[PDB]
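Sanity check record (used in CI):
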Amino acid sequence: FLPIVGLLKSLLK
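Expected output for temporinB_L1FK:
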């Protein structure tokens, strides 16, 4: 349980 989305999908970064 660690959905960053900022590294796991790079939302912005």
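The chain has no helices and no strands. If this sentence no longer matches the regenerated tokens, the check is flagged for review.
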